[PDB]
Each structure stands twice: as structure tokens, then as C-alpha cells.
Design a protein around this ligand. Structure first.
Ligand code: CA
Ligand code: CA
Length: 100
């Protein structure tokens, strides 16, 4: 058997090589090529690079898009992502809300 993950569970003998090309054929799913964009974005704004983004740091991210938040606003925006309550936002928390 090939080390290749997932090959074909069906197909007894009398069959070309097509499994389900009459239903969907080509699969629909954005390649991780888009995921790497998630990091480089908010991750670079992390001046400490500790892997977490604080309020003062996140305040530099929003302004970049064209939304400059005040010292009073960047506080309520960070609590929207920070569900665990660590003062900073973790990759995962932001990676899920970035997708379906
Ligand atoms: Ca930081
Ligand atoms: Ca958090």
C-alpha cells in the first residue's frame, strides 16, 4: 500500500479510476496558502513577538486599515477576541473567526 493518505475504499475491479467525478469531482477548499496570510497580518503587529497581541498593539493594526481607535476603544475591541481573558489575543481565537 502507498504511504499516500486516502486513496480509494471502493472500486472492486471493473472500473477506470474515477470515484465520484459525477457528483462534485473537483474538491472545494481554500489551500493553507490563505492561512499563512492570517499570521503575517496581526502577527507582525505584535511588537513583542511573544505570540500575543495587546491592546496598544492591536490599536496599530486597526489604524492600518483606516480605523484609528482611541485608548478607550482599543480596550473594548480586544475583549471581543480575548474570550479566555488573558489581556491579549491568541492565534487560534483569531484563526477561527477568520474562517467559516
Ligand atoms: Ca505582544
Ligand atoms: Ca485571548
Amino acid at each position: 500500500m502507498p504511504f499516500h493518505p486516502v486513496t480509494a475504499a471502493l472500486m472492486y475491479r471493473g472500473i477506470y479510476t474515477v470515484p465520484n467525478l459525477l457528483s462534485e469531482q473537483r474538491p472545494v477548499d481554500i489551500p493553507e496558502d490563505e492561512l499563512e496570510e492570517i499570521r503575517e497580518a496581526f502577527k507582525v503587529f505584535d511588537r513583542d513577538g511573544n505570540g500575543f497581541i495587546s491592546k496598544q498593539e492591536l490599536g496599530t493594526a486597526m489604524r492600518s486599515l483606516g480605523y484609528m481607535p482611541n485608548e478607550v476603544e482599543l480596550e473594548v475591541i480586544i475583549q471581543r477576541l480575548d474570550m479566555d481573558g488573558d489581556g491579549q489575543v491568541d492565534f487560534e481565537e483569531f484563526v477561527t473567526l477568520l474562517g467559516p
